[PDB]
Design a protein around this ligand. Sequence first.
Ligand SMILES: COc1ccc(-c2csc(NC(=O)[C@H]3CCCCN3S(=O)(=O)c3ccc(C)cc3)n2)cc1
Ligand SMILES: COc1ccc(-c2csc(NC(=O)[C@H]3CCCCN3S(=O)(=O)c3ccc(C)cc3)n2)cc1
Ligand SMILES: [K+]
Ligand SMILES: [K+]
Ligand SMILES: [K+]
Ligand SMILES: [K+]
Lengths: 348, 348, 348, 348, 144, 144, 144, 144
Amino acid sequence: THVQGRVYNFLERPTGWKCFVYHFAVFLIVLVCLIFSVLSTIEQYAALATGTLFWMEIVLVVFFGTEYVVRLWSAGCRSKYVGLWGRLRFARKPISIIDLIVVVASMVVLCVGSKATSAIRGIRFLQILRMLHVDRQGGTWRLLGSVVFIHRQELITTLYIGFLGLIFSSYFVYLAEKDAVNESGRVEFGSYADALWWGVVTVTTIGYGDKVPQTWVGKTIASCFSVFAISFFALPAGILGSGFALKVQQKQRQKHFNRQIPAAASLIQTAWRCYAAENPDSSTWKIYILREHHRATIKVIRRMQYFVAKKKFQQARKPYDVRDVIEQYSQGHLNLMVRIKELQRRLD
Amino acid sequence: THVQGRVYNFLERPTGWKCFVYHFAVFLIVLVCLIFSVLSTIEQYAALATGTLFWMEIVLVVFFGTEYVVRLWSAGCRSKYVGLWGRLRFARKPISIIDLIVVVASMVVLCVGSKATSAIRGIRFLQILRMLHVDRQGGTWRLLGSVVFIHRQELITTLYIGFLGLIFSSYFVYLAEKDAVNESGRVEFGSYADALWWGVVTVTTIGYGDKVPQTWVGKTIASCFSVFAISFFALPAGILGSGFALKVQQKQRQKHFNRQIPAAASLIQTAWRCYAAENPDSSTWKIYILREHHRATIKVIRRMQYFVAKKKFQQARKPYDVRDVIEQYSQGHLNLMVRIKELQRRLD
Amino acid sequence: THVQGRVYNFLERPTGWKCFVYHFAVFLIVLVCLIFSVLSTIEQYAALATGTLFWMEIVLVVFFGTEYVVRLWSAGCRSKYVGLWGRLRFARKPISIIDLIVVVASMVVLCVGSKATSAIRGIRFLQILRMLHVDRQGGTWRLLGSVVFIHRQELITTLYIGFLGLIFSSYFVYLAEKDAVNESGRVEFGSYADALWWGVVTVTTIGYGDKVPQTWVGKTIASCFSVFAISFFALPAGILGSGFALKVQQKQRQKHFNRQIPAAASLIQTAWRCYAAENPDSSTWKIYILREHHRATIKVIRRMQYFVAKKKFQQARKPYDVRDVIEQYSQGHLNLMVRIKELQRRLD
Amino acid sequence: THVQGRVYNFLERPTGWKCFVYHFAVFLIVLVCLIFSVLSTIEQYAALATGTLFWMEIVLVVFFGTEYVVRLWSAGCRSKYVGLWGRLRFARKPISIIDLIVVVASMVVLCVGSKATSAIRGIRFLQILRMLHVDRQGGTWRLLGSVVFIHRQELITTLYIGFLGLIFSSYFVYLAEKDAVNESGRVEFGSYADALWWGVVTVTTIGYGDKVPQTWVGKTIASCFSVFAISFFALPAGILGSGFALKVQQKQRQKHFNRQIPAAASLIQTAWRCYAAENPDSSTWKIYILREHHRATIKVIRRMQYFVAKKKFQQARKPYDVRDVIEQYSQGHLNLMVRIKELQRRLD
Amino acid sequence: TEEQIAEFKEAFSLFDKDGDGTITTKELGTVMRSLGQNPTEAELQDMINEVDADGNGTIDFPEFLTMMARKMKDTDSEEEIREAFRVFDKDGNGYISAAELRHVMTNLGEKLTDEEVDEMIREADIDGDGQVNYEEFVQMMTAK
Amino acid sequence: TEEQIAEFKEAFSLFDKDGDGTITTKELGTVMRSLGQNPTEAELQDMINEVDADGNGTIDFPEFLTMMARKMKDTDSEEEIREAFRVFDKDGNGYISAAELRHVMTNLGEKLTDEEVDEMIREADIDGDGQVNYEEFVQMMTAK
Amino acid sequence: TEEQIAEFKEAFSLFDKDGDGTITTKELGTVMRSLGQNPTEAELQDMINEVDADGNGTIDFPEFLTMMARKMKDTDSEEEIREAFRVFDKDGNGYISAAELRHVMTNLGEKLTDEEVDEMIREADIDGDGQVNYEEFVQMMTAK
Amino acid sequence: TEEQIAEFKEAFSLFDKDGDGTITTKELGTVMRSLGQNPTEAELQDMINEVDADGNGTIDFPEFLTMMARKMKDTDSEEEIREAFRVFDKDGNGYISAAELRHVMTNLGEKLTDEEVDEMIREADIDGDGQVNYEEFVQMMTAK
Ligand SMILES: COc1ccc(-c2csc(NC(=O)[C@H]3CCCCN3S(=O)(=O)c3ccc(C)cc3)n2)cc1
Ligand SMILES: COc1ccc(-c2csc(NC(=O)[C@H]3CCCCN3S(=O)(=O)c3ccc(C)cc3)n2)cc1
Ligand SMILES: [K+]
Ligand SMILES: [K+]
Ligand SMILES: [K+]
Ligand SMILES: [K+]
């Protein structure tokens, strides 16, 4: 039944170019439908857009619905997806929920709208929402969440500190300039809310220029603030960049080392050997060639061997470091000198 | 008296979720009281805010005051805090000073205000000031100060250089454009103060746009300035990010290595052995089995052993590096070849 | 015929100062001609510029045309460029196409224009286009493309995510503020196009200030957006900087290690030895001192040796890492202990 | 004559706090005089400033002049500064030229001005120029220049590329919007000069907002430009930060390793031994215990030893790396196995 | 757990063989060589590092009990075993070939007896184009 | 390919020398020492690492066939050889000196017999001021 | 300090044992083996690296005096000892258990004599639920 | 330079001792042991690495000539020597003490004969409070 897995990997785990050409095409179709929705807002072009967004909509719903059904049937190539309950587990994950919501809500809106302005008010958001459909495996999102989690302390730190500096400096500016009137006669810093607004738009280096301080006190404080606080709203860029880079690079350098394969073999083998231990009449007992107490000790050794293999494999899943070098050099030199002494005794 | 340490670690060194839920709740309460203070500024909502900030204020002062007393009593679980003088040392540290000031000043303002606009003028700052209460151990601040101290030279450097470039380029612009009149008829660059203002808001990439150069000389200089000087007000972000990251990562990778434990044991043991050395009738003298001069040499050896352990432990407190590898390889190879020669002689 | 290679390396692979002085001079000439073209736009100075851009143009076309012909003749010093077809391959590469287009189009425009305003409309772009002529080997472009390719996943990721955040937050702002009227009476956020404009100019930290949100909902969303999304349009700076740095540094540290030379020797030598294997009457067969089956085994060994040398050299082309250390330590210690056992047996 | 070196290191190579307090004080004095000069520009305070800048000026010139003479006399503690010619070499370096120019020009302006508005027009620049006096050793500038030189290729690259993108995109915008009229009726993009201005202020993320594109073509191009080009004017921050950090850190980690001391000893010793070689009747010839040809071979060996020590010391001046580990492991293992074979032969 | 600690004290006596209460590397290698196994020194060292929590280099009886006490049917061990299979999975569909598995067991890592593999294969429904669902084996040998 | 696999089975028999079907390090070093070569252990190890794809440490017959099957006239091997020459090229023009090449062959790496070099030089048009185009050698020895 | 340097010259004579004025690794290992200690070579090396400031590899008499001259009751050594205890502190409250401390002393690091530990425990007020304040020990053994 | 290359061919003959034209590690260690020096293998290796530019492991006669040809009075060697002194300079003023220098020469690195140091000190004006300007020594021993 190779057809099933074939179309699966064509749809879910794409490689090559034909796959890529397909997914890129679908991306272009969804972007194009979006930009028609963009042009639905402009009063100059709400004429054509509203009309052409009726044909495209039904085309896309039949497309993606057919596609979803094919996909859901093809998922059975996996092992945890076979069975009705397997399928129901396959629809449980997020992106499939997204696809289902989009298609079903498209059907609802198109069937109510033909016989309705709130329709299009919904269509625009659905067109916006379909973009989630591109990432077929959530690799981007998983990467981000990982790297954010690793660096949670740094980010909480800079967030806290920049927050405080914003609060305090903006209060001080508010006190300084609640009376200051703009050249146009209006008061920019009426309230602490507006000072907070100014502070946010300043500290992060945007500077619309809609609120400016006038008095020497405010300018002094704004200078110190803008010079010493902005750098806390710009750390995350560097942190996240380093994290993304290192994450990806380790994830692709681990595509090379092959000791993972023997270690995995060893792990599986000792695990099943341990399981064979419990049953008394297992055949594996013949490996030692009557069993007064041997049951115990054999179980002990095999148990240990299992946990040893477990940890060796686990540590093999990670890159190398200086600790490995130091420890192995120690062990080797020690075993060496032990043998040196053994021979130095053999001379007697 | 486990109740004491239990509530301590519930309040001061929190872990789990119940602790976290509590601290998060308290954070929400203080943020919410702040934003009511924010709305006290807006003339539309100074009615409700001033009123509701009377009930909440007394609720919070009884809350945090009770909390502080419980905390100060529970501190006795520590060893340097037992005793009245221990407590008085516990209140001496900064964050406790903060908490005390907030609660006491709250009591003062609420008792004067009920029987008073300067009151609320103080309340807003106290609400702002309570946010310090969140970090229970100053981890954020300690981290920042550490990383800043490490990179003090780089930061002084970039500060100095960007400062100079600002001064000189802004003077040149002032000379260029003290006559230039805006389209609205006013002169932006009246004084060197305003050119400095423009320079600060430019070099740091904000750009309110309230001051702009008009003449070709000013635009030329501003281009060169903005292209070649801005990068000195943006180094600190990268520096601080790298520092935070590395600091945290080393601080959590050191949670693993266990040679610290034997080295600490060794240190304590040789230290107390050295102290046992001085007293002549110590029992430890029996370890060697009469003391003509042995006093001296034993003290010498034990003294040395102490400083050896001291430095070994100290160096064990830090991560690994290539120096370790090189030195230990040298030592091992040398000891090896020495034994090789010893045996090569044994063959005779 | 050393003249040929001499002028080649003077023009194509420059070193020293005289070369550098020449190329720098040519750069100044092209920049200067550009800035005259700049001044051709200003109505105050379209008089002089249009006139002086007639003499300079013919000077430059004769200069660069003579230069191109000299260059194309001098290319024969290389080996893949000798022959008419070699030359035709030399003109096939991009930068030579650029040079040819510039000179030829210059001839066309100058001959049509003397006996014509669309001329100068073309001249400005050709002056702009000549700047490609500076990089004689495309080192900048090759570097960029390399480093971009390496980090393609990170960049696609941040692009995707920042794109989505832009789309969604800008839609939300549009809903919030399609009714909001500016102080000047006009509506900034008329359409979703304008909200996208605002979003682009915001998220990337420019902030012209031509579009601002007025309503508390918009300001809230803009705050969260500007604080949490901007950092995705600023990752590429850090990523690309690290990549450029590391790329260059490895490319210049590899100027030192010399094991590449023996490995290359070995590679070439075993390759040609393998090729000598096929011909039966090769002289190399005398190296072993009749050939019943020796043909096979000799071919097998030499084949293997070739692929061994291939991979050793390939791995020698790259910098060092911890893997090398670990593997070689293992191998050495193992070979050692094998010999230890061999001798321990020799004692019997 | 320890007084001389004492005051030298108090003035030139300061350490401690008293030194630091002095230099910090002098910095405050110069900053304060500057800010009076700042207030000389403001018409409200040109009264007091011009007056008080007469007393302070003479105070400072006598101060710094006395200081310079003391300094120049104290420089003789060094060895290359003793002698009149040594002093004349000491005044030749930049910062001393700066100090001399400031004091002398101060004398000139104060003596012409008392018996003169161009005076103060000069004073402001001299006050600005005195800030160079702070860095007593040019450590900041030397650091910057070093790190810039190391990363010259990357910076030239990004400069070139961002330059090109600016030129081309700004031309395209100019073509798009030479007709576009602002809401206020004026034409922002009159000339390509103004488009270049807009491009500079955009690409670098300032955004004054004085020039904005109106037409959909311009907005499209500006979006692509601002999203894909800005990151080239922000690389230098990351590059320079990494460079500063690494530079400083290596410069302070090299304060620890002590093999530099034996290597330096060895170097000096073999150098002078080689020099002792030439003179026939040197005493050092007795180290070997008649000289038929021994002259030659001894000179050969000593010459080699010198260059060996030279390179060993040179390499000792730098930090460690994996190359060291690999090479030394190889050498040690090889020497080992050689001795293994030697003994394996000894058993016969 | 009194019978449990009884059996564990019994089992610990077989390794102790004296009144020490600690297990040395030699003290374990002897027991193993009685079974005709011939482990390497570093192997016994690795076995004994992953039992002791004191770092001294031997197994106290509480450490022995801690080892015995924790369970193989674990939230994490299940995932480890499942992720170990996937190294040998072509296309990652959750199935592997019969002959492939037989080849991996008898050749890689600690090579198995052929009859042990013959037992292993028949534990699971091997039919259906020769493919086998390895999560079945996981649930089986994690059932304890 | 039946005659091809016939010859490859024949050739594999010379290394196997028994009914194992796998080639050990010793099992290859013996064959080589029959030719009077005296390779190092690590040399045979490196030879045998770059044949097997199982990681076990010997050469199965399919691995032997995989080795024989792939081609020297390759898109990548051509580039590798061409880039190997350039290490010895002064000015990178695509030409090298006769005497220089003779010196490199007879001294560096696995030193060649002089007469082998005498054969090597005359394969290419060596005249024309003594220079030689090495891409000619590349196309020659990549013609197979 | 004349009696101090007198005693230090006396003590240095016991290690010197001749007119060298420098102490070799062997020259110290002999003295220690007279006490029945049996140190390792690298141990004596580490002992002797942390005395000399010349880097030559022996202890001059001024270096010996420098060692003796500096004090144990130090601002930094106090902190080091205090921070060494905290490795063994559960909950970090500044208290540790009696039995725990006895276990750590007699087992980890350079194992102590039991009676030495019996002396150690009774130096401090051990009562009060068996807990002990270790800063007391710190102040004691840093009193000199 | 004909007498120069004559003397260099003469000197090279003393190391060659046969018609090889290359110098082996042994081939140099023999000459040195004739002088009663006893160098280490790695020492001769380091000596010989910094002569050859071919990487083969011996010294051709042109390499020998290249060594002899380049000069000690160099723009860079002067700076290296000057910067080597500064390691031992307190306060960096360009002066060092007489006794300090005598101590450094006779103890650190390749220890000198005392009379050699007695020659060394008197080459420079040592008077003037015992200080000495080491740039004088630099200019002297870089005068060749
Ligand atoms: C151009 O050269 C530079 C530029 C900047 C630095 C640098 C290092 S640490 C740092 N800021 C800071 O460490 C924090 C904290 C100290 C004050 C300045 N900022 S605060 O405004 O956010 C701020 C303000 C007020 C409150 C209540 C909390 C937070 N600024 C170093 C070198
Ligand atoms: C886009 O590609 C780029 C962009 C920038 C660089 C780069 C490296 S170093 C550097 N600036 C600098 O090194 C400093 C110093 C030299 C002039 C420019 N800046 S200054 O204005 O602060 C400045 C101006 C005037 C004064 C008195 C002090 C300081 N700019 C490299 C590549
Ligand atoms: K901005
Ligand atoms: K703006
Ligand atoms: K910005
Ligand atoms: K702006």
